Amino acid sequence: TVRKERDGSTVIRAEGKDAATQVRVENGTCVILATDMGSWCDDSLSYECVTIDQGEEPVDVDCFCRNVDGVYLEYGRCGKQETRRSVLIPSHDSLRTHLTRVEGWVWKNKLLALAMVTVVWLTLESVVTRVAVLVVLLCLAP
Amino acid sequence: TVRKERDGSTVIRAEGKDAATQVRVENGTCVILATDMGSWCDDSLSYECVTIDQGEEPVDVDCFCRNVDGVYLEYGRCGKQETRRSVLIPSHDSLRTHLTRVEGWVWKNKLLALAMVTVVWLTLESVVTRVAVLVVLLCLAP
Amino acid sequence: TVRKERDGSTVIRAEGKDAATQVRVENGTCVILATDMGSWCDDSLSYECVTIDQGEEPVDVDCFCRNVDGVYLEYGRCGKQETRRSVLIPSHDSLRTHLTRVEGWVWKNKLLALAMVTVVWLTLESVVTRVAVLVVLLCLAP
Amino acid sequence: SRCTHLENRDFVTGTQGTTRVTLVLELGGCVTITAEGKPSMDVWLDAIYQENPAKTREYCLHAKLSDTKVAARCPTMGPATLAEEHQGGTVCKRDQSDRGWGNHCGLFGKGSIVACVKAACEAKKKATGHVYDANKIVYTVKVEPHTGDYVAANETHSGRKTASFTISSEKTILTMGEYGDVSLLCRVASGVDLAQTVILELDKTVEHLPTAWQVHRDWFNDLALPWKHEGAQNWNNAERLVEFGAPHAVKMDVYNLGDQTGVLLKALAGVPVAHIEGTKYHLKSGHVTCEVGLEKLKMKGLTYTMCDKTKFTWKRAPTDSGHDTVVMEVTFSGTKPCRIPVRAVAHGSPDVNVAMLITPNPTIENNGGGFIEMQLPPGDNIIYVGELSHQWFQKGSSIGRVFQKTKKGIERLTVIGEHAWDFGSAGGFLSSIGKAVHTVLGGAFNSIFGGVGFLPKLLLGVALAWLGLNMRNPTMSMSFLLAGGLVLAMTL
Amino acid sequence: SRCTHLENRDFVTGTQGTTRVTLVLELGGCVTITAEGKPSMDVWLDAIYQENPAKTREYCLHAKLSDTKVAARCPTMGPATLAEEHQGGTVCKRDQSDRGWGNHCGLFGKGSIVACVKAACEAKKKATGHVYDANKIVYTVKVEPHTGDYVAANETHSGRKTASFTISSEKTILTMGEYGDVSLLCRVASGVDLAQTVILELDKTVEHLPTAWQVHRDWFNDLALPWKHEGAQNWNNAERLVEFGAPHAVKMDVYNLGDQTGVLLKALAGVPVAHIEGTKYHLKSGHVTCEVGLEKLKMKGLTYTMCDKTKFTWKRAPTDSGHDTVVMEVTFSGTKPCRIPVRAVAHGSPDVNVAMLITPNPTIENNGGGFIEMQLPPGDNIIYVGELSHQWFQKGSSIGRVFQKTKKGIERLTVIGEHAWDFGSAGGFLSSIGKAVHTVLGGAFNSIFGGVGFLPKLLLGVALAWLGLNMRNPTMSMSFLLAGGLVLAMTL
Amino acid sequence: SRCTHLENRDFVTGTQGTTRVTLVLELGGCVTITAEGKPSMDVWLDAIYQENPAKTREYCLHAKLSDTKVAARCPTMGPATLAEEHQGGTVCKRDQSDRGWGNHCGLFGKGSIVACVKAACEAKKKATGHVYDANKIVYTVKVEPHTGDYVAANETHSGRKTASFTISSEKTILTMGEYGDVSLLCRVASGVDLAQTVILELDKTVEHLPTAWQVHRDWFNDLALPWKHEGAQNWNNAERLVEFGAPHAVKMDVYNLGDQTGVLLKALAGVPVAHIEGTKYHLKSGHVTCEVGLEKLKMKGLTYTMCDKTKFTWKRAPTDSGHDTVVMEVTFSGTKPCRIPVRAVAHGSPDVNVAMLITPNPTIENNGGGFIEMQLPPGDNIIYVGELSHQWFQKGSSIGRVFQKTKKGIERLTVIGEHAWDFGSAGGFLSSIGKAVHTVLGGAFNSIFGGVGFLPKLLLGVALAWLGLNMRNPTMSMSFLLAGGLVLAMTL
Ligand SMILES: *[C@@H]1O[C@H](CO)[C@@H](O)[C@H](O)[C@H]1NC(C)=O
Ligand SMILES: *[C@@H]1O[C@H](CO)[C@@H](O)[C@H](O)[C@H]1NC(C)=O
Ligand SMILES: *[C@@H]1O[C@H](CO)[C@@H](O)[C@H](O)[C@H]1NC(C)=O
């Protein structure tokens, strides 16, 4: 298929069966080396089709038209079967923790534990209740 | 351009100028479609050339032949102007330093050095061994 | 347009419509491939148009002539629809100031604030001069 | 009643001569309310739900590309520009391509190339995410009145009624019809931080299940997919579902990453399935602490005469119900309606009544009747309905009942502690302390004090106070405190 | 009168028997010279400007390329050269380039190539700067008399005059008409770091605004653009507006970065537009420490008749001016010219007036006359004018007035610090100390002491000196310093 | 003498009655052996090298693909194989590709595709690596005798002799024409950790300079490139230099990453370049500890007479040699060969021999001679050569010389003591103590006792010991220690 845009540039609206064909446009003729075409729909690619002299051959091109200027191939990529990779999304002891948390607080606060022990030892003077005082102090840092 | 190998298959040998043409083989027609060819050399890629029925168009290929079986393509990749990613190669007196380190520690540890000096000068009573004590006191920090 | 300068070197004054055509000089011919030409102006980009033999095709060359030596191209650039960039241009009472800084320093040193009194009220015991001493101490901190 | 078939049952009964009682309602846990001289009612938090919750953010899982274009220029000719480049809702990239001899570019080198495509992802694939709002949640609390009819677990009592309760709404009145009215003053509270949970809902397609989930807010906010807020059509960060192939001379293909609902399903295995229906979104963590009023209710059929003495039979023999009570079903063949004669005595003491019926004034109706629920003291247990006699032996001890009631009351006071204490002022603090003490000691006062009356309770309190004032060690203050607590409980 | 509408106003009173007054002027501020039996002038700096400041250097924002040439030589031929390489006004870079069998150069490898183009920028795109000169600045101060006609907030005054002042010329004399001659000998000080300010003036554009600016000298001296001094044909450092394309065999294009005025305007957001008036360039910060002469000022209308007391009527009610002054205006339509027997009597003192007129002997002329401004003590007072009357009270206390005068004196002495005293000689130091003391205590002495006379001042000084030498605490001799200060103030 | 040029020159003196002398030799350093009655030699380490070091691993940069291939089969029809898949020197990758109508396969499945290619990398682009062999390192020591012939800084004396030294070979004796034989017996070492230094050199190239480096083993052993061992045809892990493209049905391209010389050279910027000369791999560290046996030397030209004292002229005037010694070249004119009568006298003592000749018995041969090097005491003096006489003063200042000798002895003990530590038994301890004392204070003892002799030295030691034996303070006991030290140095 061929058309004519308002700006003076042709549009070779190709399709699946046009692969490896030789379409004729204006004073010249040209081909379509693309080999992934399909039907026509919203999913439509449209890239410039180069123009080369007679004494030349294409290099890494899919459409090339000689003896004509401004040819834009345009084909729908849908109408065939499925290139695609999924994105990576991450997937979604009653007293055990208390003892561990208290031990961690003591270790990271050895000065605090030493001060708490020395308080009962010297100022509080509660050897009978020193165990209770130490337990309360430890519970003060859950 | 066309060679009949001894294994029962035909290999089409193409140059850069032969892109997007139709070359006859045996009884069928092979239409070279790949466009990134070049002058022959050691670097030669050779891939199977598909064969398709009368009423089927090609998709996702760049070499197809009709009513002829067992055709292979082959073309070099030299002469053509030249994914060039690059790998990652990571790049790469005796007591004077000790005396320098001690001087730097004293300069940046004014408080501790002053405290040590005051302690020595206030509780030494060892002017004979004052230097010996101070040497160890100053050099201990590392 | 062609013309031979006094030095013995020919110059071609290409125009906008001269794109992709031939120009005959002396006995050889010149080929123009530039696609950035336009009407004549002071914006003249005159550069050497290398000449080659008949055995090699041009590479990386816009203008090339055969069977002629010493030919220079030259053309204007106005009357042509348009690459721009931008350079880096960096974007463009007194007692209270001291009083505010002093108040901030006092408020950031609550321990120092307490120590100031703990030292003055004991060592100085000279309220008449202790006020001045405390003021000097407070002003000492920047 | 419906509550005879549930595990979590609590007998929150008001004191003698009381008109209101505080309640704590946890979904799935019934409560039975009783009051001397009044009919008994059953209540429970049927369901917690919000309707039409606000939607916060939308992800989509299948991009729908279209109108993709490409442009290129020979080297040393400036960049390539497209109209779609500066528009909205377009994904595109700028690259360079190896132009040369075969592309009709005079100068060999690198030339600019741009491929820009409009991106607006498909329909019926948006992963809508709704967010719960605390204020607008609505609770439902049914009220089933006891009658003489047995009800199966699935069947719904005909006389059941329902009510609504929002945080703003405070006072509501219900109509029980023949039984009168009930006044509800419910305070609602959500026990979990709802701002850190967002319900994720795929667009409603019934091809498979499930299509709704509750997910942690951070995880749902850190999904690597295009996201738009409601109102702005353009999809922010749409590049995540489009990849650009290597550039050829003039053509730069634009692939599509395709559908991605499958990976999302595979990543949500084992997550609880949010339970929704219609336009209501249910919850699973809540409780409403209400204050039922039992003043306008009137016991039904107080004028009915006695039934037949010999026309009574057991439809279903008495059996335990796992709630420290006994069920019992009977039929009738004489003239109806008439009040059911029921009583209980103790072997060896055949002239003492020990029947404290849970159901009030059992009666036989023309359609329905005969259901009986009651609790007996441990030990000798005899049933005398008409002339039928059944032998029962209930385990446990009265001390055990008192201890269990005290523990249950303490636990209930622990659940509603947030609103069970007020520290705004001194009078409010005293009121909160008194309410807490009443809640704690209600079971003890009810069990210990039965038929005591004002004079006996007052005399006991006076004796306890005198004991507190009696000569003893300072540790005796516990006895004085107990005396004061008992006196206060008797006063209220 | 005129500056009664201004905000930053000051009152400077000259002591009786004194023939000069020191003063300080600054932008947006007025002064009201007042002396006994002499017309009350008004002095207020109008504007400070320079004439055609010496332009320093010019940045032009659009380089007009022209006449570009290229040439190259392949390996085994030596480095390439071009005629314009060492010519002035041209810029270019030499770079390697590829070669091969395709362009007649048999040996492969990298050659040499040069491409030089003339650089020049068209008119209407030069961002020429400007720098001030310390001596060339011109300061103008306007002095106007007091006429009894009310003047609007923007209307001029026919009688006002003007004078110009600069560091070079100091003295000058004015003539106000019939009032007399006012002599000003002002020594000026530039109050800004003028060495660190420059005017970045874009060239003329009729519609686009703005054009002038003020920018710190360091910034304007660091702009990354081509620059030259006026009178230089070339453009020093012209490579900042030219980028060279890749080397393609022989071709090497020379792109143009285009206009830059947009970026420069974008980089001057929120910068105060520099006032421009004709060829005058205006400053914005400065002050003048001027000395005002009063030797030959004559007050007008001393021997006029008296208007009949009955015939008077108001035009504007008295109102608070805003500087502890009362502004009043009247209009009369009878026999002219005459005097206005203005007087205000404090409540309870019908015989004693406490109104001191700022207007010198208010008078009714053929044109104008009637506007009278007064300053009155705090309290309740009744303003009398002929037979008209009004009831008015002030705010604040005389102590407040003394404190305000002291603060104003301190501020005035602080701003003249650079030229307030000198210790070159003992006599000069003594004179400077006396001048500073007078400046700091003149208002206090005038307000506290008025019309006492030489004899009262001598008696007060003697009594204070005797009191200082009398018995008192060792450190309680501040009376001596007070007596010394009072004697010094009253010495003049 | 080739040592009259090097900046650092250690002096070692041959003590009277001594036939052995230890040494320490380092790169860029020589020691001028001088002994009484024997010719003075020069000893230094010319250079350290290894020959044909073993090759450990050779990376190669520019991979060279060849003879690539692919193969594929219709879906669900068995995997595809290749004849080159299982051979050596190959890099094969498997994958699956789409298929459909255009692939001549019935069902729209996805079959198997295989593609791979030979990989032998380009010649003259290998980065070989060698590692030094500690036991095979060869140390070169060259000994030159002293002759009256002046030698330029870059000229080879005809009498220079060479000697090789390895770990195994220990003792070697040289011959020097007429002078005699020097018994060299050296022990070698190497400071640089040979196990942590691998020399990397890429194949020979003219443009690429430098073409060698010294790099850490832990870096050269983990280069992300293909690697093999010398003598292997195939390359291990050649996949690091090939990138496989996406499959299009039947064909998938195999790209090439090009050479890496640029990246490697960029990564080695600022790294030492190891000296290479043909097949000799030089080093830059290490030192030789050696002892020399002077027993077999004979002074040259002792039979000659003395020329007349009036036929001498200076060709090179006396000048500072940089090591507190003088050098002078004198040309003769009379009959030859003969001796050179040279002497120096201190100013004020013109009849005492004071010069300390360095050249042994300076002489003039048939053709050659006249270079004289001397050491003189601090202060002025006159140098006599027959009739001639020159003025000169020495800057040393004696005490500085003694201190420098002590410092040099301490440095030599520190450098060499690491290996010269004997403590096997009592004899070993005595030997170690004696060696330490000698290496520490040999110069001090020689200078302290200059010409005293064995008997005078013993007498001085006896006197010092007798003085020390006298009772005094503990610090005074050091006299005995000094006597013992002098005796041991004067008797060992
Ligand atoms: C309730 O369940 C019972 C037993 O499962 C069944 O017999 C009865 O029909 C059910 N009733 C209803 C209303 O579903
Ligand atoms: C400015 O002056 C004009 C006449 O010169 C006058 O009409 C106008 O009222 C003045 N502006 C104000 C704000 O009074
Ligand atoms: C030694 O070096 C100098 C300059 O470096 C040179 O002139 C001289 O020729 C060299 N020696 C000899 C023997 O050539």
Residue numbers in the entry:
A (entry chain D), B (entry chain E), C (entry chain F): 1 to 82, 86 to 95, 111 to 160
D (entry chain A), E (entry chain C), F (entry chain B): 1 to 492
List sentences from the manuscript.
The prM protein stabilizes E, preventing premature virus activation and its fusion at low pH with the membranes of the trans-Golgi network (TGN). Flavivirus maturation occurs at mildly acidic pH, when host protease furin cleaves the prM protein to a pr peptide that will later dissociate from the particle and the M protein that remains in the particle, resulting in infectious viruses. Our atomic models of the major viral components, the E and prM proteins, indicate that the pr domains of prM have a critical role in holding the heterohexameric prM3E3 spikes in a metastable conformation.
To acquire a comprehensive understanding of the immature TBEV particle structure, we investigated three strains: Hypr, Neudoerfl, and Kuutsalo-14. We observed a 1.0-Å root-mean-square deviation (RMSD) between Kuutsalo-14 and Neudoerfl atomic models for the Cα of prM and E ectodomains. Thus, the prM3E3 arrangement of the immature TBEV particle is mostly maintained by the interactions between pr domains within the prM3E3 spike. We were able to build the linker along the E protein up to Gly98, including the conserved 85-Arg Thr Arg Arg-88 furin recognition site. Within the immature particle context, the furin cleavage sites are located “inside” the spike and are inaccessible to the globular 88-kDa furin without a conformational rearrangement of the spike.
